[PDB]
Design an enzyme around this catalytic site. Sequence first.
Site, PDB file in Angstrom:
ATOM      1  N   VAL A 131       0.841  -1.074  -0.123  1.00  0.00           N
ATOM      2  CA  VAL A 131       0.068   0.015   0.072  1.00  0.00           C
ATOM      3  C   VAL A 131       0.936   1.302  -0.039  1.00  0.00           C
ATOM      4  CG1 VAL A 131      -1.940   1.301   1.275  1.00  0.00           C
ATOM      5  CG2 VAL A 131      -1.575  -1.316   1.316  1.00  0.00           C
ATOM      6  N   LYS A 161      -3.405   0.524  -3.203  1.00  0.00           N
ATOM      7  CA  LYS A 161      -3.271  -0.661  -2.939  1.00  0.00           C
ATOM      8  C   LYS A 161      -2.761  -1.444  -4.164  1.00  0.00           C
ATOM      9  CE  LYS A 161      -5.294  -4.956  -0.825  1.00  0.00           C
ATOM     10  NZ  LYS A 161      -6.611  -5.916  -0.997  1.00  0.00           N
ATOM     11  N   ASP A 214     -13.310 -10.732   8.076  1.00  0.00           N
ATOM     12  CA  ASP A 214     -11.993 -10.533   8.736  1.00  0.00           C
ATOM     13  C   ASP A 214     -11.781  -9.231   9.484  1.00  0.00           C
ATOM     14  OD1 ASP A 214      -9.330 -11.538   8.894  1.00  0.00           O
ATOM     15  OD2 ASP A 214      -8.548 -10.617   7.308  1.00  0.00           O
TER      16      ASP A 214
HETATM   17  N1  LIG Z   1      -6.560   2.819   2.966  1.00  0.00           N
HETATM   18  C1  LIG Z   1      -5.391   3.333   3.700  1.00  0.00           C
HETATM   19  O1  LIG Z   1      -5.008   4.363   3.794  1.00  0.00           O
HETATM   20  C2  LIG Z   1      -4.535   2.124   4.048  1.00  0.00           C
HETATM   21  C3  LIG Z   1      -4.731   0.976   3.611  1.00  0.00           C
HETATM   22  N2  LIG Z   1      -3.968  -0.118   4.080  1.00  0.00           N
HETATM   23  C4  LIG Z   1      -3.134   0.010   5.011  1.00  0.00           C
HETATM   24  N3  LIG Z   1      -2.365  -1.126   5.216  1.00  0.00           N
HETATM   25  C5  LIG Z   1      -2.849  -2.313   5.298  1.00  0.00           C
HETATM   26  C6  LIG Z   1      -2.043  -3.573   5.382  1.00  0.00           C
HETATM   27  C7  LIG Z   1      -2.508  -4.990   5.608  1.00  0.00           C
HETATM   28  C8  LIG Z   1      -3.409  -4.786   6.663  1.00  0.00           C
HETATM   29  N4  LIG Z   1      -4.459  -3.896   6.607  1.00  0.00           N
HETATM   30  C9  LIG Z   1      -4.143  -2.620   6.469  1.00  0.00           C
HETATM   31  C10 LIG Z   1      -2.648   1.323   5.480  1.00  0.00           C
HETATM   32  C11 LIG Z   1      -1.627   1.897   6.401  1.00  0.00           C
HETATM   33  C12 LIG Z   1      -1.751   3.236   6.610  1.00  0.00           C
HETATM   34  C13 LIG Z   1      -0.879   3.923   7.250  1.00  0.00           C
HETATM   35  C14 LIG Z   1       0.314   3.264   7.790  1.00  0.00           C
HETATM   36  C15 LIG Z   1       1.174   4.211   8.673  1.00  0.00           C
HETATM   37  C16 LIG Z   1       1.224   5.508   8.777  1.00  0.00           C
HETATM   38 CL1  LIG Z   1       2.132   6.374   9.742  1.00  0.00          CL
HETATM   39  C17 LIG Z   1      -0.060   6.370   8.538  1.00  0.00           C
HETATM   40  C18 LIG Z   1      -1.057   5.301   7.582  1.00  0.00           C
HETATM   41  S1  LIG Z   1      -2.991   3.985   5.574  1.00  0.00           S
HETATM   42  C19 LIG Z   1      -3.562   2.450   5.002  1.00  0.00           C
END
Ligand SMILES: NC(=O)c1cnc(N[C@H]2CCCNC2)c2cc(-c3ccc(Cl)cc3)sc12
Length: 257
Positions: free
Chosen positions: A17, A32, A116
Amino acid sequence: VEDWDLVQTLGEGAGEVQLAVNRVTEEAVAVKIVDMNIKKEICINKMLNHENVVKFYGHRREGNIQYLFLEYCSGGELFDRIEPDIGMPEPDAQRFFHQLMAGVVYLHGIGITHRDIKPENLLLDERDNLKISDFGLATVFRYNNRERLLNKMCGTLPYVAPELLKRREFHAEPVDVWSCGIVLTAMLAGELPWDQPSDSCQEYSDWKEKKTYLNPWKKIDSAPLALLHKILVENPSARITIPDIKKDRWYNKPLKK
Ligand SMILES: NC(=O)c1cnc(N[C@H]2CCCNC2)c2cc(-c3ccc(Cl)cc3)sc12
């Protein structure tokens, strides 16, 4: 306006992502990337329109690589707001739980089950508003006002309901309710209660025997614990429904930090 820059890696599903920023507007969107199932995730995403569900903007397949453009949640994963062995302040857990219920009621209202639910799939925006994410396992459980029973075993063990492991077919809604109860447990105790809700898992047997003097139950106040006693009920037909969760004493208790 249509030109975007990939500025940083946000996460991995797996399997990445990335954060995209519009060179003109500076608007941000999560991207994604999937190597390369996905078609279904896109179809379900197009149905979603709720304040507590990650908004879907569009998709792009540039070969064997599919791109999903989603609402950016700068607060990251709810998982990261959970302190190991501690949890988080009760008022914060309650607010997140209220928001989770709102998102779940919405999905179930449109005949969709997430399948999930867990802190890694619950994101936070800039104002700490919870957003349900990652619909790769979601499916339709009601169509034309007719309910379809599920039979596919899927999800994440510590969060799955016991009937999934024991029954050939089961109702969708109680499974999502159960995972929300496991999420609530994690938020209030900073630990998962069991590896899986199987007859062979000692921690699950302990819960069934009401040994709440053991962790993680011992860390949870009697009020939210009473709600967990209604959610984490083995028999899905006896398990509390969302309309009744909304009537729960803790769910309605005014809390402040
Ligand atoms: N739709 C989004 O934005 C979004 C979608 N998926 C994400 N990761 C997935 C990974 C697999 C498990 N589910 C969540 C993340 C991680 C984010 C983030 C990470 C770090 C920081 Cl500091 C800020 C935002 S934003 C985001």
